[PDB]
Amino acid sequence: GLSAAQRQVVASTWKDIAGSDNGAGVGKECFTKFLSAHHDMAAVFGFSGASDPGVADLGAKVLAQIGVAVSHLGDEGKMVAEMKAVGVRHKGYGNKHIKAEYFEPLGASLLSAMEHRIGGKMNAAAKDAWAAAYADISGALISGLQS
Numbered sequence: 001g002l003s004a005a006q007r008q009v010v011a012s013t014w015k016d017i018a019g020s021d022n023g024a025g026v027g028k029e030c031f032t033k034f035l036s037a038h039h040d041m042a043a044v045f046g047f048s049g050a051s052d053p054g055v056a057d058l059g060a061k062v063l064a065q066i067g068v069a070v071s072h073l074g075d076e077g078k079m080v081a082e083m084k085a086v087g088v089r090h091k092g093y094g095n096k097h098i099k100a101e102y103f104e105p106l107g108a109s110l111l112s113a114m115e116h117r118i119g120g121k122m123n124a125a126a127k128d129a130w131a132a133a134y135a136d137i138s139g140a141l142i143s144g145l146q147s
Ligand code: HEM
Pocket: 044, 045, 046, 058, 061, 062, 063, 065, 066, 086, 089, 090, 093, 094, 098, 102, 103, 106, 138, 141
């Protein structure tokens, strides 16, 4: 759902997470560590492994879309409609068997990459606001994927 305080914490820490590369470095770290930890997930993405060039490319696109979702957080119906559309496109991505269960371990890796970039700015309040935001953003994508 996200409270106004949680929307405000994610909107303000996104400025630091985005940096000067629109979160591309965070995206690269997230998917590289995720695929190094679960080699079994490389086939779901259609990648050869964690060092496939496609990992850094996908990481930049995922984090750029989270930046769009963050700018629309004040209108939930807008944010979920656009994330559902992203989700509908995932029916035809990677192996065409992307499952909802895969999104929760990916969330842990995203939060970790975010904290690695902004350090202490990713305090307990920021981690809770971003876990709440990642739950809504991925939840809406999963809804498009299962539609
Ligand atoms: C573990 C779950 C996920 C899997 C397996 C997955 C897989 C993929 C794959 C394989 C592509 C490349 C498409 C191509 O070849 O053209 C893709 C694109 C994309 N993914 Fe995901 N994805 C996942 C999670 C996410 C998340 C959390 C977001 C949330 C913002 C996201 C956003 C996107 C975006 C924006 C694109 C670019 C193309 C588009 O807009 O549809 N993905 N994803």
